[PDB]
Chain A
Amino acid sequence: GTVNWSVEDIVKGINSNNLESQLQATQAARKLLSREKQPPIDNIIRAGLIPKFVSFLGKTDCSPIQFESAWALTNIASGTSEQTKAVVDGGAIPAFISLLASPHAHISEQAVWALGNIAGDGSAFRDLVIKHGAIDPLLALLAVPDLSTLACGYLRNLTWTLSNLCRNKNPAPPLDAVEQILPTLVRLLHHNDPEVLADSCWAISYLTDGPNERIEMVVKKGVVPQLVKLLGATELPIVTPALRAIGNIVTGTDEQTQKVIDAGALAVFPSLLTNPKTNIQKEATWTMSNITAGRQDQIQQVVNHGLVPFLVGVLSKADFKTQKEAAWAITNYTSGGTVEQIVYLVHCGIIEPLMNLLSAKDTKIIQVILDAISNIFQAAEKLGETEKLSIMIEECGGLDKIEALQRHENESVYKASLNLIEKYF
């Protein structure tokens, strides 16, 4: 009945002076726009239908046409930035924000969805959505004693749209908007739905992806223990953002990093550093690299938790991008670590896999590895042990690889290598 209309049929119906014909044509547009294969968004826009859809959002008297137009506009806004812009340029933002108050849950939800798509376009529309006042009404939809009474899909859509208001940088969301949203995120982070948890973790990962003052806003809210708990979830869609968030947090201060350690994060890293999902291993190792860039007592907790053998493991065998993060973890470890900690690292077998990576066709990892070799030697001469160390490097082919690096197409590489070959070989 409303299936497979032409755009011109839709235009004809929406231009009739007949609200029911308009509703029928808007639903036909919605069904057109709801098919996964090549929805004719541009034809719909070119036909001038967005302003009509937007005007239909205001027809409180005809809630079906609000819903159908909200859904049509949601799917136009889900398209390209130009398509989202067409929706915004039609005045949809204030019209959707007004629909958040709709008594019809499926219309309110659709407006949530539409605003998520608009905000999800980028910082400017995100901030324009915020400036139009979306946050208060969005959070009010979550102002219930127990989130579990909300419809599952509705709560998921709200959490997702909130995460888009937290998303994107240059600029990051307004500080006041973040402070306004955070209490609700913290609460969603304790909800038991895996998708709400995933999107809540994504939102926190966005908010912690910035300067330490941004991290601090999040950490002050006490979420780190919950993020660590979610770090141990079985659902990869949860572990992924929880780990991103934790990784972001340990890019901050030593005190912020220490909150992650105190929360027990390190006990999860045996699994994370051996995780069969490549991106988990990579992000876990990146996280480790920023923990080993911290204080010596923080390095010591990496040690006590038995994570140095896991770093040796990653360095020995992993996706190359993960090995590069592991190399950073080692150079940070050796830059900041006591002599005893660096000795322990050698006793765990770091030398051989470090050496094997010096044959990487990647200039940055070579530099990183050479820094670490240098830092390990520095600790050796504090013990009169450079000879034992040099043998080790020779015993596993490392001396050969440091030799070839002297003649290498890069200043810092040839420099640091040549230095090693004479200061210790």
Chain B
Amino acid sequence: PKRQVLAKIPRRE
């Protein structure tokens, strides 16, 4: 009966 973080990052500095 079991039931089942930014992906993108700009460089600013």
User: Could you tell me which A residues sit within 8 Å of B by CB distance?
Assistant: 33-36, 39, 71, 74-75, 77-79, 84, 110, 113, 116-117, 120-121, 160, 163-164, 167, 198-199, 202, 209, 241, 248, 250-252, 286, 289-290, 293, 328, 331-332, 335-336
Contact = CB atoms under 8 A, between A and B. Distances in A.
A332 B2 CA distance: 8
Contacts of B11: 34, 71, 74-75, 78, 110, 113
A335 B3 CA distance: 14
Interface in B1-13: 1-13
Contacts of A328: 3
Contact of B2 (A84, A116, A250): A250
Contacts of B4: 209, 248, 251
Nearest to A120: B7
Interface of B: 1-13
16 contacts: A33-B10, A34-B12, A34-B13, A36-B12, A78-B9, A79-B10, A113-B9, A113-B11, A160-B9, A198-B5, A202-B5, A209-B4, A251-B4, A290-B2, A293-B2, A335-B1
Given A34-B12, A35-B12, A164 B7 contact: yes
Contacts of A251: 2-4
Nearest to A371: B1
Chain B contact residues: over half helix, strand or loop, or mixed?
Answer: loop
Nearest to B6: A120
Contact of A84 (B3, B5, B8, B12): B8
B1 A332 contact: yes
B5 A77 contact: no
B13 to A, nearest CB: 8
Nearest to A199: B5
Contacts of A34: 10-13
A205 B13 CA distance: 29
A74 B10 contact: yes
Contacts of B13: 34
